[PDB]
Short mmCIF file of C-alpha atoms in Angstrom, two decimals:
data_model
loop_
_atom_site.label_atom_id
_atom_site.label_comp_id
_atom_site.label_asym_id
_atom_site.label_seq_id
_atom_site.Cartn_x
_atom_site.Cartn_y
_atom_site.Cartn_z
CA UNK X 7 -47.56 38.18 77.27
CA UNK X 8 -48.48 37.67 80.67
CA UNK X 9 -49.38 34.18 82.18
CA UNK X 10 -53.05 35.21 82.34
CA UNK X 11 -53.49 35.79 78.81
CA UNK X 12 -51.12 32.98 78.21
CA UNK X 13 -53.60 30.49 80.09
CA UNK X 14 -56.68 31.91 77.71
CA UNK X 15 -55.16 30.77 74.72
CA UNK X 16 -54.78 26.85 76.19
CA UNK X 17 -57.06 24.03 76.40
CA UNK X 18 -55.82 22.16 79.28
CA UNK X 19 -55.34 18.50 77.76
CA UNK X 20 -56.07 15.10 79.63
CA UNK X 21 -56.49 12.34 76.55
CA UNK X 22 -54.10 9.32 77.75
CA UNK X 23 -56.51 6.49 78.15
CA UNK X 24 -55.61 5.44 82.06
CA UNK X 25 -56.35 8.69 83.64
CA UNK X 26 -58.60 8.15 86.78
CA UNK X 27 -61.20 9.87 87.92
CA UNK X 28 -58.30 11.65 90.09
CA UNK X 29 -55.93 12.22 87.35
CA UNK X 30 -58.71 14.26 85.39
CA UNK X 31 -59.82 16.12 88.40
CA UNK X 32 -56.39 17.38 88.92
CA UNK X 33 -56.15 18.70 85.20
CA UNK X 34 -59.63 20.51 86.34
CA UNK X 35 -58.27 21.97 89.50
CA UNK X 36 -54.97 23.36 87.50
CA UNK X 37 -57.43 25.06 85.31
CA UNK X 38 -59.15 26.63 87.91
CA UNK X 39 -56.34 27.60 89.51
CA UNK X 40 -54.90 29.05 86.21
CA UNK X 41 -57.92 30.11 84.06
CA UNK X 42 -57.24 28.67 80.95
CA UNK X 43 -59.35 28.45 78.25
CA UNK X 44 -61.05 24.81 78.64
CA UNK X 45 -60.72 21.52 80.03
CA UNK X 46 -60.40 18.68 77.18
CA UNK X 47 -61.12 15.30 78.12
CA UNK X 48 -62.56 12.43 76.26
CA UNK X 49 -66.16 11.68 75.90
CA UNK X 50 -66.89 9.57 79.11
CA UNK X 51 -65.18 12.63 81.48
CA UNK X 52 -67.82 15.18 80.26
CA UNK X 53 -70.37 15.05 83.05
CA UNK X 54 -67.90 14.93 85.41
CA UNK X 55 -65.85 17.79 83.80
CA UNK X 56 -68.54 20.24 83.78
CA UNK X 57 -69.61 19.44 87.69
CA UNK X 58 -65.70 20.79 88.61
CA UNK X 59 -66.03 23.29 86.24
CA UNK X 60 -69.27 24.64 86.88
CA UNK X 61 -69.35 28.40 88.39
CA UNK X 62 -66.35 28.75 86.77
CA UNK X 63 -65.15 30.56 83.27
CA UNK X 64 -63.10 27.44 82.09
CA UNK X 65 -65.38 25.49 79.11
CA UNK X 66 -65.43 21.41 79.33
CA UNK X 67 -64.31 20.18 75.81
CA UNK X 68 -64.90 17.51 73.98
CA UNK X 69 -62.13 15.29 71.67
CA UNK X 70 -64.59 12.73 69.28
CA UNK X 71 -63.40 9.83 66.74
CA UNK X 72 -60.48 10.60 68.67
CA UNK X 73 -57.60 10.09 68.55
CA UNK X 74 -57.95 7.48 65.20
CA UNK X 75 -60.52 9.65 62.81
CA UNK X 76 -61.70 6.67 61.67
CA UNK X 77 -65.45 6.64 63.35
CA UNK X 78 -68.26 6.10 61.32
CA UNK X 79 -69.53 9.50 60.72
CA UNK X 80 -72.92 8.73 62.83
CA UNK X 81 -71.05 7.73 65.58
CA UNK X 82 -68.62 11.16 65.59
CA UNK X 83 -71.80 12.74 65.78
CA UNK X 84 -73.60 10.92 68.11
CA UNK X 85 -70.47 10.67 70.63
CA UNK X 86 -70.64 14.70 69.96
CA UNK X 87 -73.98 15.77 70.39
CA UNK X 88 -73.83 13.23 74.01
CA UNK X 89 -70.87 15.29 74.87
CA UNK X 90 -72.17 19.09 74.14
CA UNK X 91 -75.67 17.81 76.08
CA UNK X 92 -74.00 17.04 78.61
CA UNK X 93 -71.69 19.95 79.18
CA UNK X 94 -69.09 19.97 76.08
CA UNK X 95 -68.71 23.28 75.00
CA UNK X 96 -66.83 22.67 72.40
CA UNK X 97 -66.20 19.45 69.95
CA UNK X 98 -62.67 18.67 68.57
CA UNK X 99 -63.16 15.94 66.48
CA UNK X 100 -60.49 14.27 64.70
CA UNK X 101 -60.22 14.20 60.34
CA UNK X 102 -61.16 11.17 58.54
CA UNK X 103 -57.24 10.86 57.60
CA UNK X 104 -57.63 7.78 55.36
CA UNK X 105 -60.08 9.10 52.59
CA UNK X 106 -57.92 12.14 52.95
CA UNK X 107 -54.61 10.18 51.69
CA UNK X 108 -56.83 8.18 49.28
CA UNK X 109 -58.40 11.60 47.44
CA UNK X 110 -61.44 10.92 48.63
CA UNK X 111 -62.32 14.58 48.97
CA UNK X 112 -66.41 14.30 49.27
CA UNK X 113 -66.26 11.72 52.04
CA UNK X 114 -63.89 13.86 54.20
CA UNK X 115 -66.04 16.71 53.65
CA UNK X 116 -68.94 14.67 54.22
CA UNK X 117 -67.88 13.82 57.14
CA UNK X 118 -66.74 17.02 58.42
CA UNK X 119 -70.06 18.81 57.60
CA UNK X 120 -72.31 16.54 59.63
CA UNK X 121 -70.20 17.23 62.63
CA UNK X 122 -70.61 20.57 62.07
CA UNK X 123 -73.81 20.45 61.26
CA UNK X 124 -74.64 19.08 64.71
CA UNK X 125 -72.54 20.68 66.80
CA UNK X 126 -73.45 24.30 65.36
CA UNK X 127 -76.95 23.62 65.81
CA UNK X 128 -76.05 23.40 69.13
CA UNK X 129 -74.62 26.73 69.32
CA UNK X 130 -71.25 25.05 70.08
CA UNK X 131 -67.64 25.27 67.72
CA UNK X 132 -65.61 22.73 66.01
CA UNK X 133 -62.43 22.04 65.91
CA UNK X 134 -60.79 19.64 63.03
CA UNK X 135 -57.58 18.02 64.10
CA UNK X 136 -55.38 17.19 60.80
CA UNK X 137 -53.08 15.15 62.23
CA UNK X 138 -50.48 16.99 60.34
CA UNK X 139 -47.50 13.67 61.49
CA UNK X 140 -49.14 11.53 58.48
CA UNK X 141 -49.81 14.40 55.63
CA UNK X 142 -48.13 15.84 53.18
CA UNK X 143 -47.91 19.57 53.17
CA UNK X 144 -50.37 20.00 50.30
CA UNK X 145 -52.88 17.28 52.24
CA UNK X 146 -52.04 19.81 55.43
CA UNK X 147 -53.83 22.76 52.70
CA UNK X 148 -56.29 20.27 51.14
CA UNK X 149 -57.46 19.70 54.67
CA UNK X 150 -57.50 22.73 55.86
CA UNK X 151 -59.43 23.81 53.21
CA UNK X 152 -62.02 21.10 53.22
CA UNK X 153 -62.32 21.79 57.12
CA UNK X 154 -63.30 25.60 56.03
CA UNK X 155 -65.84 24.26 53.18
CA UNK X 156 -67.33 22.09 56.15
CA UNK X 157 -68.23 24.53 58.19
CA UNK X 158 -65.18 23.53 60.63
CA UNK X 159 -64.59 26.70 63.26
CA UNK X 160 -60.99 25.60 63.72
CA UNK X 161 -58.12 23.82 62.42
CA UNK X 162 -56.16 21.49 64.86
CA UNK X 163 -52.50 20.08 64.01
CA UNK X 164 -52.37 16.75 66.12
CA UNK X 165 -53.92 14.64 68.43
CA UNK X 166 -50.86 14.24 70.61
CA UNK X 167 -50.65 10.16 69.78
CA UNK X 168 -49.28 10.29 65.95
CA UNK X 169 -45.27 10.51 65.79
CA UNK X 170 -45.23 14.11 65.98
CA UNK X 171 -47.37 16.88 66.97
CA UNK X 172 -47.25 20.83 66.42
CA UNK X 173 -44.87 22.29 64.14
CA UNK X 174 -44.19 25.91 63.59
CA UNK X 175 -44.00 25.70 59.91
CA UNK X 176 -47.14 23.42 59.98
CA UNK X 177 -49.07 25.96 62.07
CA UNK X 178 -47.99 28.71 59.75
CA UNK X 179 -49.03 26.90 56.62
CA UNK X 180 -52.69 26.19 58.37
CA UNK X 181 -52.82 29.97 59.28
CA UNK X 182 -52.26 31.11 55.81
CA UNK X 183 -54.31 28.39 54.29
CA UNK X 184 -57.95 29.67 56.42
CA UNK X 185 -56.32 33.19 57.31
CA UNK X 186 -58.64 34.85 59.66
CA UNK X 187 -61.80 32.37 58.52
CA UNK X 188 -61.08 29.76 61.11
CA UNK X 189 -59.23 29.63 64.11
CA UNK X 190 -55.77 27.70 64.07
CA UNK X 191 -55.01 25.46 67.46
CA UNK X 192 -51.20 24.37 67.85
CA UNK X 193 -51.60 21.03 69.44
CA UNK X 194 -49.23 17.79 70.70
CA UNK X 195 -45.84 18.23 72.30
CA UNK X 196 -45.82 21.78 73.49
CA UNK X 197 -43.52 21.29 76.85
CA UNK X 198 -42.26 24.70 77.17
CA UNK X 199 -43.10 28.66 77.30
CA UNK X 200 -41.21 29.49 75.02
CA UNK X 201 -42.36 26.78 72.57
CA UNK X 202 -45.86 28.41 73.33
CA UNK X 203 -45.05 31.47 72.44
CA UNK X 204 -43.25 30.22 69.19
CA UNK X 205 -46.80 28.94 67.99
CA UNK X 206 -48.65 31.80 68.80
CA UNK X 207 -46.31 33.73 66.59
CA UNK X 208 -46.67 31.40 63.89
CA UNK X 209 -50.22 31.58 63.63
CA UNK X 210 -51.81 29.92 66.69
CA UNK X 211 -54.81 31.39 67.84
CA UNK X 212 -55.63 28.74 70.72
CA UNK X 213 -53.07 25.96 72.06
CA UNK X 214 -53.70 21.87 73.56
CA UNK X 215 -51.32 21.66 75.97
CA UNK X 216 -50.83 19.10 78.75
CA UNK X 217 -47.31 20.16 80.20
CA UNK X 218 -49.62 23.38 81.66
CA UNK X 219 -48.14 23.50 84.89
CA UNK X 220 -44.80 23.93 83.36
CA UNK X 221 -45.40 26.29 81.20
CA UNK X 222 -47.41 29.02 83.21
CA UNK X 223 -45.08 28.54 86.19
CA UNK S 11 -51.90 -26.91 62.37
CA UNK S 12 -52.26 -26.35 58.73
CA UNK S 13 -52.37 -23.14 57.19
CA UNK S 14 -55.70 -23.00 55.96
CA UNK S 15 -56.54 -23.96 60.25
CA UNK S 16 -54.38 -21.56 61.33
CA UNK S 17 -55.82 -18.68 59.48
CA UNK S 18 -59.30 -19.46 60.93
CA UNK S 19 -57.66 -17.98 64.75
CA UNK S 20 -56.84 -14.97 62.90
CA UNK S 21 -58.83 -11.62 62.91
CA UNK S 22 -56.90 -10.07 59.57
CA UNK S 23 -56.49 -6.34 61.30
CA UNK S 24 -55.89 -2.88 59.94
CA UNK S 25 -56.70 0.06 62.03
CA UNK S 26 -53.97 2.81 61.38
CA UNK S 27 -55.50 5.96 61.19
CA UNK S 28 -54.35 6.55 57.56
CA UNK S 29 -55.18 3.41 56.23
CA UNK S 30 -57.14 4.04 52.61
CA UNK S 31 -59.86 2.94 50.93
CA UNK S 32 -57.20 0.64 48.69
CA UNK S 33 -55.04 -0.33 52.11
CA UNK S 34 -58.60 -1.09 53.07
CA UNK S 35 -59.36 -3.37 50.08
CA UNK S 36 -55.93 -5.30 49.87
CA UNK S 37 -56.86 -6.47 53.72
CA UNK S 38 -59.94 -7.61 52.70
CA UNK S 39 -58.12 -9.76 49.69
CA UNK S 40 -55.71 -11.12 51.73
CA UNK S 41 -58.77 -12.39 53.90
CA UNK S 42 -60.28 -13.62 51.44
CA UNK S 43 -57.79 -15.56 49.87
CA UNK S 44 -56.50 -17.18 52.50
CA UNK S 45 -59.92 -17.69 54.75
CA UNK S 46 -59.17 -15.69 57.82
CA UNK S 47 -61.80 -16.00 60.58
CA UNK S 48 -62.25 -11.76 60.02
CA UNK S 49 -61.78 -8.57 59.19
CA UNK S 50 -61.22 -6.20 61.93
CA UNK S 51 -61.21 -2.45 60.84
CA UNK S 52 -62.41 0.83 62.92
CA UNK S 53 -66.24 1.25 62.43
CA UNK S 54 -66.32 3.93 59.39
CA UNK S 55 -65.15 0.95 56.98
CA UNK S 56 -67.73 -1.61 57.98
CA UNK S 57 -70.32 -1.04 54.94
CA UNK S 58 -67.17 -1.52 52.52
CA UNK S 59 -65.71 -4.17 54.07
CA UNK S 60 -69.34 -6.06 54.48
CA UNK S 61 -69.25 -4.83 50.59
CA UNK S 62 -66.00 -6.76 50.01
CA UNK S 63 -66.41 -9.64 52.06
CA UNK S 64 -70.22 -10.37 50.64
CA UNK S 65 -70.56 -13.76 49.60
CA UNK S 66 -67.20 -15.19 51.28
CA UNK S 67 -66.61 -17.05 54.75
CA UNK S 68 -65.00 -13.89 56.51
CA UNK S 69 -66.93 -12.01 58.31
CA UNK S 70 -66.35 -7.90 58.48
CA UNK S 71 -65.49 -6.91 62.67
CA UNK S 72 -65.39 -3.33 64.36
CA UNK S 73 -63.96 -2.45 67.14
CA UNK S 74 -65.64 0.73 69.68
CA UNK S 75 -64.70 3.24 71.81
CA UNK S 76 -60.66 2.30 70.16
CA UNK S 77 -58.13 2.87 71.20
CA UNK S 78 -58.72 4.74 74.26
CA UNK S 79 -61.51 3.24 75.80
CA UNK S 80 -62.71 6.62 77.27
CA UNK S 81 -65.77 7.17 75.12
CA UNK S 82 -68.26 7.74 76.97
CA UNK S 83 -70.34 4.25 77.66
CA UNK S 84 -73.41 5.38 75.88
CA UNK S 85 -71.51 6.48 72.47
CA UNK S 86 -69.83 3.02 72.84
CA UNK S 87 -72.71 1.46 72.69
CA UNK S 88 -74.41 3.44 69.46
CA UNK S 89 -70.68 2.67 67.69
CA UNK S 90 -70.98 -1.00 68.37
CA UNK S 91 -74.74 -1.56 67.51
CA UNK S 92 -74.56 0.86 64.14
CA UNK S 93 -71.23 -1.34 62.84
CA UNK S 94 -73.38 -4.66 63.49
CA UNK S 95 -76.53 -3.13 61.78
CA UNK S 96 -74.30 -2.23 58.96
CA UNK S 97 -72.80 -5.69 58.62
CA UNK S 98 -70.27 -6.19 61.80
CA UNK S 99 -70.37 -9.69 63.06
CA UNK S 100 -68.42 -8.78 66.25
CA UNK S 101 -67.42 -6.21 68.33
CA UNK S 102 -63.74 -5.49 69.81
CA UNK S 103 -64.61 -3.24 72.84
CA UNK S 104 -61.89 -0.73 74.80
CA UNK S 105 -62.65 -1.32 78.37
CA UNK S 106 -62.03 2.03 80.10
CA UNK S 107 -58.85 1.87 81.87
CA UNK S 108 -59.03 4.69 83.68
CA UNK S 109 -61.81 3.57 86.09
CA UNK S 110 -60.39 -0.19 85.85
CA UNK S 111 -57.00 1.67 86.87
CA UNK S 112 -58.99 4.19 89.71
CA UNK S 113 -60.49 0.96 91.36
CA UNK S 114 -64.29 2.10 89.93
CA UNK S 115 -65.24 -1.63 89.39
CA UNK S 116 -69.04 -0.50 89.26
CA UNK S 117 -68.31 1.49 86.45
CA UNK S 118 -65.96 -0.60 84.60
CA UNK S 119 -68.55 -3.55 84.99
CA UNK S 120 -71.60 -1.22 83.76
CA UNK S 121 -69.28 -0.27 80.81
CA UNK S 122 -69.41 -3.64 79.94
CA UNK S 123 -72.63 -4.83 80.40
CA UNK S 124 -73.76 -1.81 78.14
CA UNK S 125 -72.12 -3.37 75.08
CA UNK S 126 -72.43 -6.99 75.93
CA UNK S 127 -76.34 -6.38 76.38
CA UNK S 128 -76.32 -4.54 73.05
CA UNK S 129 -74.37 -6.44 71.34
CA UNK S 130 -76.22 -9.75 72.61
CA UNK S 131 -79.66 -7.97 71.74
CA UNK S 132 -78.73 -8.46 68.28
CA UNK S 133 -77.13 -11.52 68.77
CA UNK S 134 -73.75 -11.11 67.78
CA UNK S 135 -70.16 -11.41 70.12
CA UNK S 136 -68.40 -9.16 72.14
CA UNK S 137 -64.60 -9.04 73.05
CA UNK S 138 -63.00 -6.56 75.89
CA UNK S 139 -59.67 -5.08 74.92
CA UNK S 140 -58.00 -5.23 78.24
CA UNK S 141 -55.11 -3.51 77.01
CA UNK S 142 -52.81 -5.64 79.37
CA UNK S 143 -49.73 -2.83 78.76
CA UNK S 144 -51.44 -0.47 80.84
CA UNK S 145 -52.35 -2.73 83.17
CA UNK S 146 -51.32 -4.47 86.81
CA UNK S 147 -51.15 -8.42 86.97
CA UNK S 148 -54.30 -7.83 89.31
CA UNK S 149 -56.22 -5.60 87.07
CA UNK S 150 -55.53 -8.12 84.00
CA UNK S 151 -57.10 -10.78 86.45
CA UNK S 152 -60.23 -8.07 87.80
CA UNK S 153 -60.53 -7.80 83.85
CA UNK S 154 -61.19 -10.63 83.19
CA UNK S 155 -63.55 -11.44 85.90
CA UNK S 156 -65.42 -7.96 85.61
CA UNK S 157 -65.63 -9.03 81.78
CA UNK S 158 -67.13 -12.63 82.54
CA UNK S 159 -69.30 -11.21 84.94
CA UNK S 160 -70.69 -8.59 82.89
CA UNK S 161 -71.24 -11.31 79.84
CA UNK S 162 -68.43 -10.91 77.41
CA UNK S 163 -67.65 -13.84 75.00
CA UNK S 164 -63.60 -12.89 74.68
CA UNK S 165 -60.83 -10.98 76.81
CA UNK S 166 -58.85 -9.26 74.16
CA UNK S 167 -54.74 -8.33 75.22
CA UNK S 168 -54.38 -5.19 73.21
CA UNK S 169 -55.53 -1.97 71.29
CA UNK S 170 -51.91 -2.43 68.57
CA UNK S 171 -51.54 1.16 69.77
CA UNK S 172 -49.94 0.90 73.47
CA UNK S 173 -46.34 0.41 74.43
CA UNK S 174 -46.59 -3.18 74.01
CA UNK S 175 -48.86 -5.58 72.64
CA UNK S 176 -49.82 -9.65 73.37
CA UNK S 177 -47.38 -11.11 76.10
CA UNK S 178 -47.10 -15.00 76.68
CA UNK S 179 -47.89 -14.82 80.40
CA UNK S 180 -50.74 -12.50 79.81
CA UNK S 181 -52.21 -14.81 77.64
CA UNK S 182 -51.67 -17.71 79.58
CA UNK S 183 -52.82 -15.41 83.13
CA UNK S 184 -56.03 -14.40 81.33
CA UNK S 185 -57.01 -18.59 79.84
CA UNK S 186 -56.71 -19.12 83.47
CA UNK S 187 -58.85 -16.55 84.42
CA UNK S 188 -61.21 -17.37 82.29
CA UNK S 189 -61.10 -21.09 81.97
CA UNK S 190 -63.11 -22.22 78.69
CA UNK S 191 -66.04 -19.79 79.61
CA UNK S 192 -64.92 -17.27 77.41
CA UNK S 193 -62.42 -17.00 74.15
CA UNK S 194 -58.79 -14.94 74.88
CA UNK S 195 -57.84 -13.30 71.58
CA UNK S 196 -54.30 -12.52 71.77
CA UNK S 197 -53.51 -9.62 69.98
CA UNK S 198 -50.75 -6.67 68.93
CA UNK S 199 -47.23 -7.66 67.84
CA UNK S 200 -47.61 -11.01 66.38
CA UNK S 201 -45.24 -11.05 64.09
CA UNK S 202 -44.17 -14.42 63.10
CA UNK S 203 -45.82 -17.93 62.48
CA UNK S 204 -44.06 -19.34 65.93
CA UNK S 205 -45.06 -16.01 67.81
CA UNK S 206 -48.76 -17.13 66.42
CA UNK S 207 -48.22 -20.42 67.28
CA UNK S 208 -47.35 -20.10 70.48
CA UNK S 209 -49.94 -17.69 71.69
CA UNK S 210 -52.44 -20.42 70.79
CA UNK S 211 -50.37 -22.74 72.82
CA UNK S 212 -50.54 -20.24 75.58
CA UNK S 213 -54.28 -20.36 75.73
CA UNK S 214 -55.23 -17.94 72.71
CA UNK S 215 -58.77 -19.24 70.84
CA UNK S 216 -58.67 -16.16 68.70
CA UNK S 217 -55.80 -13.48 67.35
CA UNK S 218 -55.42 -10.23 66.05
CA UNK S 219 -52.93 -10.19 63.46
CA UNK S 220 -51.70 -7.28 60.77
CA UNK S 221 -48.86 -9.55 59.28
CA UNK S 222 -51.14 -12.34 58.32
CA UNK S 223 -49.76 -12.76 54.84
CA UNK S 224 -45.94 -13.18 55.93
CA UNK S 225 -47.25 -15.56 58.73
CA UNK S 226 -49.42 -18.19 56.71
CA UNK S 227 -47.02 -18.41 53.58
#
C-alpha cells in the first residue's frame, strides 16, 4: 500500500480544544500536501476549513455532540446541519453512550436516526463514533447495530478523549457486526504505519488519525 | 458555614459521557436531599432532570458547546437557549480556547456576547468555562475581562475534563479580576470539605462539585 492510497483512507484529525486558527490551518495544509481523505475539525472551524480546502479533493468534516454524546438530540442536529451548510461534507457525530449502558435502546436509536435523517437529506454521510473505551463488547454489537437500524453510514471506535481509542479486535468485531452495510473508521491513538495498516486489515475501511505526518513520511 | 449553607455554593455535577438515566437520577436525589444550589448535567438530560427536580429548590443547569468549546458560536447558542426552554435555569458556557489562545479577542468576545445575549433574552445566567488548565496567567486575566465585557454573570475555572481542574491562585487571580461584578464558580477536583472550603475563601461564590455527598456529611 502506497502512501497515496494510504492518505485516502485518513481523515486528518484536529479536535483538541486550544488549536488556533494556525494550528488548524496547518492540519489543512498537511492534507493538501498529502491528499487524504478529509479534514475533521470541530464545528466552529468549518467555514474556515472549507476556504483552505476549496479547489481541492480533500472534504471538510464535521465531529458533533462531540466528544461527550451527550447533546440534546436537537442540538446534534442543529450543530450538524450548520456544519454541512457551511461546508461539512461529512458529520461524525458521537453515540448517546449513557442510554446505551442504561438499555435504553429506542432513545439511542432515536437519536441516531434524526442525525441521519438530517444529514442524508443533505446528501451528506454519517459517521457514529461508539466510543468503544466505556462498552462492553456486546454494547460494541448492540451499537453497531442500532447505528445500522439508524440509518448511520459508518461506525467509528473513539473520539480520541476516552481512555483508549482503536483496537484491532474492536475494529474487527464492528466489521463483522455491519459487514459490508456500513463503513468501519479505526479512530484514537493511531501513531504509527504500521498500526495503520494493522486496522485496515482488521476491518477498517477509513482511519482518524492526527499523528499524519508520521505516518505517511 | 453549616452544611445545609454550604451546599447552596454547590452546582451537584455529573457530566461523564456514560452517565445513565439511573446515575442521572441518584444526582438529582442527592440534590435534593441535601438542597444543593443545582444540577449541572450536559443538555440531553435537562427535561428529566427539570422532571426530577419539579417542585424542589434546585434548579436543573446545562452546560454548551462542553467540553471543547469549539462548537461553532451559533450551535452554542441554539444548545443553550433549547436547555433553558426545556427547564435550564443557567448556562455553563466553553469559551473557545483556541481563538482566546490565537490572540482573536474579537472573536472570543463575540462568542460570548452570543450566549450572554441569548441567555439574558430569556432572562436566565450565564457562566464562561475558562478552562484555566489550558490557559496563560494573562489569558485567565483577558478571560475574565473579555467575559465581563461581553456580559457574563460568572467566570467558571474548568470543563472536569482537562489536565487539571480549580487551582487556589486561579480562583483568587480571577475574584480579582472580576471584583464583585460577576460570580467565580470554582470548579473540577474538589474533592474534600476543606478543598470546598477554601475555594470559597479564595474568592469562589459558586462551585462545581461531583463528590458532594462525601463533602457535606
Amino acid at each position: 500500500l502506497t502512501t497515496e492510497q494510504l492518505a485516502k483512507y485518513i481523515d486528518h484529525t484536529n479536535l483538541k480544544a486550544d488549536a488556533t486558527e494556525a494550528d488548524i490551518k496547518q492540519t489543512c495544509d498537511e492534507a493538501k500536501k498529502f491528499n487524504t481523505a478529509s479534514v475533521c475539525v470541530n464545528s466552529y472551524w468549518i467555514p474556515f476549513v472549507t476556504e483552505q480546502l476549496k479547489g481541492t479533493d480533500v472534504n471538510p468534516i464535521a465531529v458533533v455532540g462531540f466528544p461527550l454524546g451527550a447533546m440534546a438530540t436537537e442540538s446534534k442536529i442543529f450543530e450538524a446541519t450548520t456544519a454541512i451548510d457551511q461546508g461539512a461534507e461529512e458529520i461524525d457525530m458521537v453515540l448517546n453512550v449513557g442510554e446505551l449502558k442504561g438499555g435504553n435502546d429506542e432513545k439511542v436509536l432515536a437519536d441516531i436516526q434524526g442525525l441521519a435523517d438530517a444529514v442524508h437529506a443533505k446528501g451528506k454521510i454519517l459517521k457514529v463514533i461508539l466510543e468503544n473505551a466505556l462498552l462492553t463488547k456486546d454494547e460494541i454489537v448492540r451499537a453497531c447495530q442500532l447505528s445500522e437500524k439508524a440509518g448511520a453510514d459508518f461506525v467509528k471506535t473513539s473520539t480520541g478523549f476516552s481512555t483508549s481509542g482503536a483496537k484491532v479486535e474492536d475494529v474487527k468485531l464492528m466489521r463483522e457486526t455491519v459487514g459490508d452495510r456500513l463503513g468501519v473508521k479505526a479512530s484514537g491513538g493511531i501513531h504509527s504505519r504500521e498500526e495503520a495498516l494493522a486496522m485496515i486489515d482488521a476491518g477498517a475501511s477509513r482511519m482518524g488519525v492526527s499523528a499524519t505526518v508520521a505516518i505517511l513520511t
